[PDB]
Amino acid sequence: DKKILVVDDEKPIADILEFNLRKEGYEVHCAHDGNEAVEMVEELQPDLILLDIMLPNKDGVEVCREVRKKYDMPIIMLTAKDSEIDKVIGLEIGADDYVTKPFSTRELLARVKANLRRQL
Amino acid sequence: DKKILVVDDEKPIADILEFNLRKEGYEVHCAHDGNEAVEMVEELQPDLILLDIMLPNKDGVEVCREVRKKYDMPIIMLTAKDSEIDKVIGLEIGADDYVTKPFSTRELLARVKANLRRQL
């Protein structure tokens, strides 16, 4: 089972992601802040991270940079629909993809699989 | 002005893409089949290609493989909403991203900009 780390401060969003991902058959662990995420990354070595761009402490942008100093597993940012820059910025700083909130399940699961499979 | 090659055989889709992209300030060129695309690529050297996965001649998958022999500019696949495999497959064979039809303008422009800016 592919291991996914869901990093989100809003429990209902983190929980609906964890629900859909476990259902599809992933092993899912949840972090609710920045530093806890970087810790969990070293212990679990997730296959993919879903990272809120708007974490309140250490930003998703800083989580991403700090993770990338050591690890290259796929990172997908979670962003609002209404901010172009939030979608764009993660791809400049080392994330692989983004999914917008609210997301369809359909799109979440495609994006996670496609990023798990991505070429070379 | 960034140069976009739109590769799609459905004139209405190709036209609405050209309309929105021009409006946003891109230079847009349109190919309606596989072989014409590959030619236009060497000829134009687009900064990004938007490629229908379902072209009737050479597939979007074969087009993307042919192009990737020589070029590594971003390629975004255009796919239906209802097929997970069509979204996943492009990313395995050398494409960078996918956008689903019908796409919002919002999402199309954000994807194109994010892929144009993408790190390393």
Q: What is the tally of helices (H) and strands (E) in chain B?
A: 5, 5
Q: Which of B92, B114, B117 is opposite residue A118, by nearest beta carbon?
A: B92
Contacts of B106 in chain A (CB under 8 A): 81, 84
Contacts of A109 in chain B (CB under 8 A): 84
In angstroms, the CA A64 to CA A80 distance is 17
Of A88, A91, A86, A115, which is closest to residue A101 (Cα–Cα)? A86
In angstroms, the CA B66 to CA B38 distance is 7
Resolution (A): 2.0
Measured in whole angstroms, the distance separating CA B25 from the mean position of its chain's CA atoms is: 17
Return the number of CB contacts < 8 Å for A and B: 51
Contacts of B92 in chain A (CB under 8 A): 117-119
Q: Give A3: exposed, middle or buried? Use CB within 10 Å, 0-12, 13-18, 19+.
A: middle
Dig out the tokens for B58 from the structure. 């050479």
Total structural domains within chain A: 1
SS3 of A35-92: HHHHHHHHHHCCCEEEEECCCCCCCHHHHHHHHHCCCCCCEEEEEECCCHHHHHHHHH
Strand order in the sheet with A97-101: A27-31, A3-7, A48-52, A75-80, A97-101
Evaluate whether B76 touches B55 at the Cβ level (below 8 Å): no
What is the experimental method?
X-ray
Exposure letters B27-48 (e unless 16+ CB within 10 A, then b): ebbbbbbbebbbebbeeeebbb
Flag if A98 and B114 touch (Cβ within 8 Å). Answer: yes
Cβ neighbours of A27 (radius 10 Å): 14
Measured in whole angstroms, the distance separating CA B27 from the mean position of its chain's CA atoms is: 14
Residue range(s) defining the domain that contains residue A105: 1-120
In angstroms, the CA B72 to CA B59 distance is 18
**A106: closest chain B residue by CA:** B84
In angstroms, the CA A112 to CA B113 distance is 21
In angstroms, the CA A32 to CA A90 distance is 19
In angstroms, the CA B27 to CA B1 distance is 6
CATH of the domain at B15: 3.40.50.2300
